[PDB]
Write a protein that binds this ligand. Structure first.
Ligand SMILES: C[C@]12OC[C@H](O)[C@H]1O[B-](O)(O)O2
Ligand SMILES: C[C@]12OC[C@H](O)[C@H]1O[B-](O)(O)O2
Ligand SMILES: [Ca+2]
Ligand SMILES: [Mg+2]
Ligand SMILES: [Mg+2]
Lengths: 337, 342
C-alpha cells in the first residue's frame, strides 16, 4: 500500500494459509499458560540481541523482559548477549557475528540493516529474528528469516488515521514528524498521510524527519510550527518524537494542537492521563516478547515455526477511564509489569 | 555490625521503647484479621511503587500481590503506579526516571535502598518533599537521618537471615572448610548478606574464604560468576550465594560442571527456591514469611490514614529450610508465607 517489495501481514497470511495456521497456533500458544520445552538441549542456546539504547520508549526493554521471562517459564537454558546501541553516531558493533549465536534478534529500519541481514541470511547458520517488522520481504521468498515479529505499523497507523478522520473534517491542516529516515517512517508516516489525504481530504502542511530522540522531536516540532503555525494536529511517528513534541506545544502555548503517541508504553500512558498526549495506539506489548520464546521453543522441538507474528492494538484516548487504562496495562505488561 | 552508620533493628527498638511498642503493635495487627479503615478518605490515595523487575525471585511480585489484597481487605481506595526500572545503564537515566515520579505527587512512595545512587535520591525525597517514604527490603535505620526518618523501613532483616544460614553452615561443616562467596550487585545487600555470613563463618568457625565475586543481580550473572569462581578455585566445599537469582544460576553452573560435591544455598525461600530445594538442587535456604511485609505496609498506611503513630521499622520472620524437610513442613511454611499471595 505504501512500499513496494513486501507482503502485507494479512496478505501474507491469505497467500499462504499454512502460515495463517501457524501464526494462529502461535497466537494461542502466546495466550495460554506456558507449556515447557519437551526436548532438553545439550547445552544453553546462545541468543544475541542488538537493540536501540536509551530510548524513552520502553518497547525494547519490556520486550526483552517478557522474552526472558517466558523463556524461563518454558524451562529453556539460554545465554543472552545484549547490546545497547547508543542513540546513533557506527553500527559496526554488529560484531555479534563473532558471537556465533544460535538466535539473532535484530531490527530492520534502514538499508544499512538490509545489507547486513542479507549477509546473515546468505552466510551463517544463525536463525534471524526481525523485531518491529511484520511484512515479509519478497526477495527473500526462497530463504525467509526465522521470524518477523512486532506490532504492524500499517495497522496501528491505519487505526490512528481512522480516528483522526473520524474526529476532523475535510481540509483539516496537519504536519507530520517522521521517525529517522527508513522503513518505520515510510510505513507509519505515509500510511497515515495517504489515508488521511485521500479518504478524508486533509491537507498536509509539512513533514520533517527527526533523529528519533525526544530532543529531536521537540526541535522538529518547533521548526515545523515556526514555518507552519496554522495546523490542527501534528502526527508523530514515535514515542520519543511525540513526547518532545508535547514539550514544544507546551512551551509555545499551543493547546489548540492535537498530538498523538504511537505504541502506548508507560511514558505515553502517563502523558495521556496527564492530558498532554491526546490519542495513541497501544500495543499489547508483552505478546511479542512471549512470541519469540514460543517460536524458539517449537524450533527446539522440531515443530514448524510461523514466519510472521503481529500483536494486537488498542486505541487509547485521554477520555478513557483510569479503569480502562489499568485493564489495558494488566493485559499489556502482564510479564514486564 | 558489618557496616557503620546504621541502627541495628533490635538496637533501634532497644533505644526507643515506644518505637518497639509501635512495632509490636504492627506485628499484632499484621497477624490478626483485617480491621478495616476507620477515617475514610475524600480521594483514592496515590501510591508510587519503584521495584526492580525481571527476576526469578518472586519476592516483589508477591509483596505487591499481598499488599494490594490487604489494602482491599482494609477497604482503602488507591491508585498504584509501577515505575519501570531498567537495571540497564545509565545512572543518569535512572536518576531522572526516578525524579519523574516525584512530580506524580503521590501520597506514599515505595522504594528500595541498595546503592549509594539510591541514597542521594532518597535524601532528596526526604529533604525536599511531603511524600511519605516506605523503604522496602531494609530494616536498619540510617543514623544520618535521625532528624527526619522515612515513614517506614520494611522487609526481612538481611543480618538475621544471614546469621541463621551461617549458623547452619557452622553446625554442618568443620573448621578449615573452604568456601566461596557470590555477592549480589554492589551495595548494602551484598555488604550485609555477604559480610555477615563471612564474618561469622570465618571468625566463629574458622572457615577459609577462597574467593568472592560481585554479580549483576541476575541468574545468568550468577551462573557466569559460579563458573569463573570454580575455574579459579575448584577446591571449595560450598558456595554461599547472596540472592535467589544468583543462587539459582550457581545451581545450573554446578549442574553443568558436574560438581554435586559442592553445597549451595538460596536466600529468601520463594517458589523457585522451594521447588529447587524439593528437587534437591538447592541444599538449604532461609525462607521468609513473605506476605507479612506486604500486609505490614498495608497496615502502616492504614494507621497513618487514621492519624495514628506508625513505627519507623518492621522486620518479618524467618525459617530455615533444608532438602531434608518433609513436604508437609514445606506445605505448612507455604501456607503461612503465601497466605495472601497464594
Ligand atoms: C518500537 C518503536 O519503533 C521505533 C522505536 O524503536 C520504538 O518507538 B516506538 O515506541 O514508537 O515504537
Ligand atoms: C528481595 C530480595 O533481596 C534482593 C533481591 O532484590 C531479592 O531477591 B531475594 O529473593 O534474594 O530477596
Ligand atoms: Ca566486605
Ligand atoms: Mg513518502
Ligand atoms: Mg495540548
Amino acid at each position: 500500500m505504501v512500499l513496494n517489495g513486501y507482503w502485507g501481514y494479512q496478505e501474507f497470511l491469505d497467500e499462504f494459509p499454512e502460515q495463517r495456521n501457524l501464526t494462529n497456533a502461535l497466537s494461542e500458544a502466546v495466550r495460554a499458560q506456558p507449556v515447557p520445552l519437551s526436548k532438553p538441549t545439550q547445552r544453553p542456546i546462545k541468543i544475541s540481541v542488538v537493540y536501540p539504547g536509551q530510548q524513552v520508549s520502553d518497547y525494547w526493554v519490556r520486550n526483552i523482559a517478557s522474552f526472558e521471562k517466558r523463556l524461563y517459564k518454558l524451562n529453556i537454558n539460554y545465554q543472552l548477549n545484549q547490546v545497547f546501541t547508543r542513540p546513533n553516531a557506527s553500527l559496526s558493533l554488529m560484531e555479534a557475528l563473532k558471537s556465533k549465536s544460535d538466535y539473532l534478534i535484530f531490527t530492520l529500519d534502514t538499508t544499512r540493516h538490509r545489507k547486513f541481514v542479507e549477509h546473515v541470511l546468505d552466510s551463517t547458520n544463525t536463525k534471524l529474528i526481525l523485531q518491529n517488522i511484520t511484512t515479509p520481504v519478497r526477495e527473500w521468498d526462497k530463504h525467509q528469516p526465522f521470524l518477523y515479529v512486532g506490532f504492524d505499523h500499517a495497522e496501528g497507523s491505519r487505526e490512528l488515521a481512522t480516528e483522526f478522520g473520524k474526529f476532523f473534517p475535510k481540509h483539516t491542516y496537519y504536519s507530520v514528524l517522521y521517525f529517522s529516515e527508513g522503513y518505520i517512517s515510510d510505513v507509519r508516516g505515509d500510511t497515515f498521510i495517504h489515508q488521511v489525504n485521500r479518504d478524508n481530504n486533509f491537507e498536509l502542511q509539512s513533514a520533517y524527519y527527526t533523529k528519533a530522540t525526544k530532543q529531536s522531536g521537540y526541535d522538529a516540532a518547533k521548526a515545523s510550527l515556526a514555518k507552519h503555525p496554522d495546523v490542527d494536529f501534528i502526527y508523530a511517528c514515535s514515542t520519543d518524537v511525540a513526547l518532545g513534541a508535547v514539550d514544544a506545544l507546551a512551551e509555545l502555548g499551543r493547546e489548540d494542537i492535537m498530538i498523538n503517541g504511537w505504541g502506548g508504553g508507560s511514558a505515553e500512558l502517563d502523558a495521556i492521563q496527564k492530558g498532554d498526549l491526546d490519542i495513541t495506539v497501544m500495543r499489547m506489548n508483552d505478546d511479542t516478547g512471549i512470541a519469540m520464546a514460543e517460536a524458539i521453543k517449537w524450533d527446539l522441538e522440531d515443530k514448524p515455526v510461523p514466519t510472521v507474528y503481529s500483536g494486537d492494538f488498542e486505541i487509547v484516548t485521554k477520555a478513557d477511564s483510569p479503569e480502562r487504562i489499568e485493564a489495558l496495562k494488566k493485559r499489556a505488561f502482564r510479564y514486564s509489569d
